[PDB]
Write a protein that binds this ligand. Sequence first.
Ligand SMILES: CC(C)(COP(=O)(O)OP(=O)(O)OC[C@H]1O[C@@H](n2cnc3c(N)ncnc32)[C@H](O)[C@@H]1OP(=O)(O)O)[C@@H](O)C(=O)NCCC(=O)NCCS
Ligand SMILES: CC(C)(COP(=O)(O)OP(=O)(O)OC[C@H]1O[C@@H](n2cnc3c(N)ncnc32)[C@H](O)[C@@H]1OP(=O)(O)O)[C@@H](O)C(=O)NCCC(=O)NCCS
Ligand SMILES: CC(C)(COP(=O)(O)OP(=O)(O)OC[C@H]1O[C@@H](n2cnc3c(N)ncnc32)[C@H](O)[C@@H]1OP(=O)(O)O)[C@@H](O)C(=O)NCCC(=O)NCCS
Ligand SMILES: CC(=O)N[C@H]1[C@@H](OP(=O)(O)OP(=O)(O)OC[C@H]2O[C@@H](n3ccc(=O)[nH]c3=O)[C@H](O)[C@@H]2O)O[C@H](C)[C@@H](NC(C)=O)[C@@H]1O
Ligand SMILES: CC(=O)N[C@H]1[C@@H](OP(=O)(O)OP(=O)(O)OC[C@H]2O[C@@H](n3ccc(=O)[nH]c3=O)[C@H](O)[C@@H]2O)O[C@H](C)[C@@H](NC(C)=O)[C@@H]1O
Ligand SMILES: CC(=O)N[C@H]1[C@@H](OP(=O)(O)OP(=O)(O)OC[C@H]2O[C@@H](n3ccc(=O)[nH]c3=O)[C@H](O)[C@@H]2O)O[C@H](C)[C@@H](NC(C)=O)[C@@H]1O
Ligand SMILES: [Cl-]
Lengths: 216, 216, 216
Amino acid sequence: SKVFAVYGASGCGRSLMPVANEQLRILEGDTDSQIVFIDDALDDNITVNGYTAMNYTKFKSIKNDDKFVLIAIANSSIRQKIADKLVKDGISLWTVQGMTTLIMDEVSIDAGAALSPFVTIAANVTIGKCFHANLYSYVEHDCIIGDYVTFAPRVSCNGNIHIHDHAYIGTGAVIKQGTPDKPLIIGKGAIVGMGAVVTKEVPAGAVVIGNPARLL
Amino acid sequence: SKVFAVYGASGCGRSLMPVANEQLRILEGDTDSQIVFIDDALDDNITVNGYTAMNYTKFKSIKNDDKFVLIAIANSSIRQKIADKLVKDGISLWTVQGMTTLIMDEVSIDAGAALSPFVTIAANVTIGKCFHANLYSYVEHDCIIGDYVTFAPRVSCNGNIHIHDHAYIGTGAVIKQGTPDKPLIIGKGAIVGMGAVVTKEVPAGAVVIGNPARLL
Amino acid sequence: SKVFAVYGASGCGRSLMPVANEQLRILEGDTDSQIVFIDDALDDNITVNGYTAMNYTKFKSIKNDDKFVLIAIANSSIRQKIADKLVKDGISLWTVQGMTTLIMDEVSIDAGAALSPFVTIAANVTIGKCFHANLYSYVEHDCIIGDYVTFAPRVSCNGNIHIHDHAYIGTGAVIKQGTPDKPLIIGKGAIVGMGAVVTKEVPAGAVVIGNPARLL
Ligand SMILES: CC(C)(COP(=O)(O)OP(=O)(O)OC[C@H]1O[C@@H](n2cnc3c(N)ncnc32)[C@H](O)[C@@H]1OP(=O)(O)O)[C@@H](O)C(=O)NCCC(=O)NCCS
Ligand SMILES: CC(C)(COP(=O)(O)OP(=O)(O)OC[C@H]1O[C@@H](n2cnc3c(N)ncnc32)[C@H](O)[C@@H]1OP(=O)(O)O)[C@@H](O)C(=O)NCCC(=O)NCCS
Ligand SMILES: CC(C)(COP(=O)(O)OP(=O)(O)OC[C@H]1O[C@@H](n2cnc3c(N)ncnc32)[C@H](O)[C@@H]1OP(=O)(O)O)[C@@H](O)C(=O)NCCC(=O)NCCS
Ligand SMILES: CC(=O)N[C@H]1[C@@H](OP(=O)(O)OP(=O)(O)OC[C@H]2O[C@@H](n3ccc(=O)[nH]c3=O)[C@H](O)[C@@H]2O)O[C@H](C)[C@@H](NC(C)=O)[C@@H]1O
Ligand SMILES: CC(=O)N[C@H]1[C@@H](OP(=O)(O)OP(=O)(O)OC[C@H]2O[C@@H](n3ccc(=O)[nH]c3=O)[C@H](O)[C@@H]2O)O[C@H](C)[C@@H](NC(C)=O)[C@@H]1O
Ligand SMILES: CC(=O)N[C@H]1[C@@H](OP(=O)(O)OP(=O)(O)OC[C@H]2O[C@@H](n3ccc(=O)[nH]c3=O)[C@H](O)[C@@H]2O)O[C@H](C)[C@@H](NC(C)=O)[C@@H]1O
Ligand SMILES: [Cl-]
């Protein structure tokens, strides 16, 4: 027996719960396990879109040895804080993908990814912990994505790109491919703005916007 | 017995007829009902891509009590004019979606929407009359879309956006999310240009272009 | 009996091989035929992502009368050179599409197209030799695409556009629709940069960038 949850019942979680249901009901063939929202804004349990929603105290208190959680909070500092809490409390991080999520050959993705509908993860890609790939995003050949990286919808991450930990790539951003000899690097905790067209390495902690991308 | 039609046999209609066939043949499981084009440019009936095409006089003259029409004309002033005519003549507005159109939880869409392939309508979205969501467009969590709103392909409408009646959002436009406290508003009859990156409220009747979006 | 191949085992080929397998195993229902990589960088045979990879000398030497090749090299000058070699050596050019590739009515596509997942080819489109439509690209109503045209991912080619031979359209580029009276032309060997917003005819051999698109 198992219990599943989506951690976060705001916009991120409510748009991932259908995806978590595709993962659980169809890709895992599991019509038996219950799935709930966790949200620490809650004191008393409520329902959100027809699902039981409870705080983490209540979720921990459930008498089941086999808990699986997708963290659906886009802020990667919160996501890492919650991931470390879950693992310390013996709760499993749970990767979710949609029926229309395309995974190609020799792809490695750490536990707890949120892979939205219409996402492509292409050939020979490596992805670290609790990756968020929102609707329509792709990661193309030979990319290395670090830990707690967050893509908005419709991110175009071309080939031979290395994205370091905690980077955020905004809606519809386009990133030029690197080369095998010189991967294009997005530095740790960098922010690429919505619609930015990234043609060069982005420094760690930089915010870049526009076409072409410039420091903000 | 029923008769279906796509109103408009130009580019909008010819790229929606396959979608209307997915809706009718697969999602409604209906292999019996006939589907035709209506186009008032026609005097004599013709065929368009292997479908009978006739003007509205001829379509009205069909002896069937149960008519269903998708309006495939992108100009929203024409679309509203035709919708009001159809309803007055006792003809039903017909929502069409593709096999790859994704509708999430607690979504409300008024009759007569054209929801193209690869469209996502995410959690807790409300949409008014004869919405056009062209290929790859999405409407994310908590949005409220008014009447006769038109999206070109690949519109990125993020969460907590309110789009008023008759707005037009151009190809690949990106709209910044609002907040629960302050939805980002696109005003009545506003035009957001292709590739525009919208980061603030757009006034009613405004035309905005570029990255970032500015008045034209 | 037949032998299939993907010509090019770098990023283009490795992200197309899964698509070639969807085409062969599912759309052609063929679990019998072998599929390999050809790559002329190879001296001795190797494996690439669990597929045999050999140079063209070795591929020619295979004793089979019925060879089918998808050219997965994005550089269209190389692609044409290889296509002419294959045809001269009595090897068939092979069109591949994904399970999520959408082809609409009255579409004509010459042999040897690479049609990626989530690609739409809309109504009444005509496409010439060895077309590349990378992930998420679309070609909308009434377009005419010439020979050895290459789309990066997420190209938005709207209606009534004529793209001449050997043009390259970069990641996330948007092209304004033409009219029936005046198709918007992308000239021979033109390059449209990533994220370019094309609102007018592009001259043959021009490089255009930005929003709006300008000569570089
Ligand atoms: C880039 C970004 C992080 C900057 O955030 P911020 O510092 O709060 O910026 P503000 O909204 O205060 O705007 C700063 C200025 O830059 C502009 N700007 C903001 N985002 C921009 C963008 N992506 N491209 C270009 N200009 C942008 C604003 O219009 C403003 O101009 P002004 O000073 O003349 O008024 C933010 O706008 C962004 O792009 N975030 C991603 C949104 C997104 O992807 N949503 C998807 C959710 S699923
Ligand atoms: C924004 C828009 C409505 C303006 O239309 P318009 O007033 O007829 O504009 P024009 O085509 O005459 O061009 C006006 C100027 O702005 C530029 N321009 C036009 N559209 C632009 C856009 N989206 N972004 C930036 N610049 C744009 C033109 O290049 C031109 O520059 P110029 O005066 O230096 O020559 C139109 O270009 C547009 O974006 N429409 C949407 C197209 C689309 O989404 N098609 C999908 C069909 S399914
Ligand atoms: C437009 C393009 C062909 C130009 O290539 P290039 O001539 O080698 O250009 P460079 O990378 O040397 O950069 C030239 C300058 O223009 C800028 N630039 C490059 N591409 C740009 C683009 N698409 N939009 C805007 N500016 C761009 C660069 O930042 C640079 O600015 P700088 O001189 O101030 O440093 C190329 O950048 C491009 O867009 N290619 C498509 C990439 C792609 O689609 N990849 C998908 C692979 S599947
Ligand atoms: C306001 C805003 O920009 N929200 C965007 C954000 O959604 P969330 O990541 O759900 O961010 P929220 O701040 O809206 O919500 C986080 C939720 O997480 C909960 N939370 C947070 C911390 C914690 O320790 N426990 C916990 O339960 C918290 O109570 C809240 O309900 O990320 C999505 C990917 C965005 N999506 C789109 C399409 O625009 C949302 O608009
Ligand atoms: C020229 C142009 O920009 N056409 C774009 C428009 O297609 P339509 O909405 O089909 O616009 P049209 O003007 O081309 O056609 C409208 C059709 O509607 C018919 N019509 C119009 C009025 C009416 O009362 N009756 C009626 O039958 C009219 O005869 C005509 O055949 O909207 C699509 C969504 C665009 N798509 C793309 C991908 O570019 C088309 O290019
Ligand atoms: C470095 C680079 O920009 N590669 C991009 C290119 O991938 P390819 O078209 O695979 O280009 P390559 O130069 O990387 O490889 C071509 C292959 O083709 C082979 N080749 C070339 C010539 C020939 O005669 N025989 C032959 O076998 C050659 O040995 C090589 O392995 O085109 C894709 C569509 C891009 N995709 C993305 C998503 O970024 C790749 O990053
Ligand atoms: Cl897309």
